[PDB]
Design a binder for this molecule. Structure first.
Ligand SMILES: Nc1ncnc2c1ncn2[C@@H]1O[C@H](COP(=O)(O)OP(=O)(O)OP(=O)(O)O)[C@@H](O)[C@H]1O
Ligand SMILES: Nc1ncnc2c1ncn2[C@@H]1O[C@H](COP(=O)(O)OP(=O)(O)OP(=O)(O)O)[C@@H](O)[C@H]1O
Ligand SMILES: N[C@@H](CCCC[NH3+])C(=O)O
Lengths: 317, 314
């Protein structure tokens, strides 16, 4: 099996399993100019009719942080022309939105790259946005949430398809993306967060994963099976969660007595939703009010009390 | 708060949260001679009456692997004599046992160790075994499972109470254990197995975890919160998985019709229980029969066929 089919087989597999494209007609690619983006594009133009797409276009965002960005942008317009594709370029100063909004260069650009994409989508009439997220991004992300503290959501990471976003390379490993770009002799722009190990994701990618791989070289593959199991168990619990939530709220309060003899796993999913907080301690606080009567203060004036069959928000302040 | 009250309260909290001890009278301690063993022993002797324990004793296994072995065994007896405790000591040639049985060394020791402990437990009339596992073993354990492939079970790691085994320092960090020992002026044996990054556990312990704490210095406490959550979620899934295994398994079959209209999460759970295998692959091969005709060959004669309304065996 060659590098081409090794990627295309996984993309088709993903399509089967998740129905990545099932009616969408116009696709907008979150094109960065990077290998994964280039390979993402090469694969979609090769499957354009297979997916019954009417049009595939690029959308590049110039964060204006580095100097190369000016050059990265040139590559993208060129690439688009070599492909005879439509492309929308966007220029914004993260740094000047991440300063006048208290933001890390990163987070601020994320918001902006997306705003522009949502923009390009709803305005130009595209049905969805395709991203180049791949299996290693999911490994790093998942491991980050594990590090930062989390539950199933973080362990699952992002999904192959969520609302308006589609991630065709979800099953593909970075090395497979790399091998395919070389095999087909594609050109792209290098990785210049190439080792700014000061950022967690990058520390995980360059210093953690390589160690874990010294334990299990097929970590990514082994990692994928675990996510499939968890996604399902999560889906189920979240499903049961709504069952109980509604089985439980009255308007603006929660029925302690009914929720008191329900499974802990579920009580916690319910509280989490009632209060709009995922923090473990805040959850336990509110949970304690199920047996004990009284008050608990969470944060933005989120104060909850027990009437006595009920557990509500205090209206004060 | 001092290094002692710090650890003591976490043990009292684990006891309050899990009922570690609740009728046991004679505890046998899996005593390695290392810090954790030593702090475990010191905490049980101090909380003996509180837990209503009639006796606490030490069990030390000489793996015969390291050169200090003999010496350490001696320290162990002296540690016992010092606190006027019984000490049972087992010795076996792990090394050899592995070669005449096809076992690496991790497994060999493990096998003989626990075997030795269960024998003392029975021939000495002990109710349970107290191990010195701690939160950092848990964190190292769960990362090993996340690396080798796993589900909730692996992520959760060992539990505070599992059968005959007890783990009173489950909530305690290795750092707290080390401060405890210095504070109370305790003596212990050197862990000459830190090094060897060849051992995955140590590679995680020395290379992986350190990098993670540079992202979150509170990794262990944060990991614990995650475990508690995962545990109750896992409890609910297994319970719901029991109901379904009973609502669908009628004989040596599974009511496809009923099991096909239920949650994937559960299906796999039902399948896993039915076919006795747990790996993702077999379960999914078997799982397709709920939708496609045919039969499957998993292991040693483990083959299942799909009838019109039933997924039974051959
Ligand atoms: N300059 C860009 N213009 C448009 N889209 C981009 C650009 N950079 C990245 N993307 C899109 O976002 C995806 C993820 O990129 P990257 O991992 O660098 O962002 P992150 O912010 O680091 O990740 P996430 O997007 O997971 O936060 C890329 O694969 C691509 O689909
Ligand atoms: N030589 C020994 N004699 C008796 N008990 C021991 C000995 N070594 C270890 N133990 C017990 O086993 C527990 C776990 O030890 P450790 O985790 O270092 O070994 P492992 O091989 O990693 O064990 P597991 O695989 O059970 O974690 C120790 O806390 C102690 O209670
Ligand atoms: N260096 C640590 C660990 C030594 C081995 C402990 N069993 C200490 O002595 O505190």
């Amino acid at each position: 099996m060659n590098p081409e089919s090794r990627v295309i087989r996984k993309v088709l597999a993903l399509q089967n399993d998740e129905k990545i494209f099932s009616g969408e007609r116009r696709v907008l690619i979150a094109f960065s100019g990077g290998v994964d983006s280039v390979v993402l594009t090469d694969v979609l133009l090769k499957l354009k009719n297979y997916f019954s797409l009417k049009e595939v276009a690029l959308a590049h965002f110039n964060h204006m942080l580095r100097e190369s960005a000016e050059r990265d942008e040139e590559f993208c317009k060129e690439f688009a022309k070599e492909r005879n594709m439509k492309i929308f370029v966007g220029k914004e100063d993260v740094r000047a939105f991440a300063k006048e909004n208290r933001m890390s260069l990163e987070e601020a650009g994320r918001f902006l790259r997306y705003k522009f994409l949502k923009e390009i989508l709803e305005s130009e009439g595209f049905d969805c946005i395709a991203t180049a997220h791949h299996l290693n991004d999911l490994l790093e992300t998942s491991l980050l949430f594990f590090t930062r503290g989390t539950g199933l959501d973080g362990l699952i990471g992002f999904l192959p398809k969520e609302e308006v976003i589609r991630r065709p390379l979800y099953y593909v490993k970075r090395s497979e993306i790399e091998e395919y770009a070389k095999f087909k002799g594609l050109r792209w722009v290098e990785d210049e967060t190439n080792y700014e190990v000061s950022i967690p994701r990058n520390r995980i990618r360059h210093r953690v994963i390589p160690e874990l791989k010294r334990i299990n070289e097929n970590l990514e593959d082994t990692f994928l099976k675990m996510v499939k199991v968890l996604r399902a168990e999560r889906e189920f619990l979240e499903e049961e969660a709504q069952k109980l939530y509604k089985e439980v709220k009255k308007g603006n309060c929660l029925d302690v007595k009914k929720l008191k003899e329900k499974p802990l796993a579920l009580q916690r999913r319910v509280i989490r939703k009632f209060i709009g907080e995922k923090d473990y301690e805040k959850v336990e606080l509110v949970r304690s009010l199920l047996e004990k009567g009284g008050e608990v203060n969470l944060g933005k004036g989120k104060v909850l009390k027990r009437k006595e069959r009920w557990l509500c928000f205090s209206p004060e302040v």
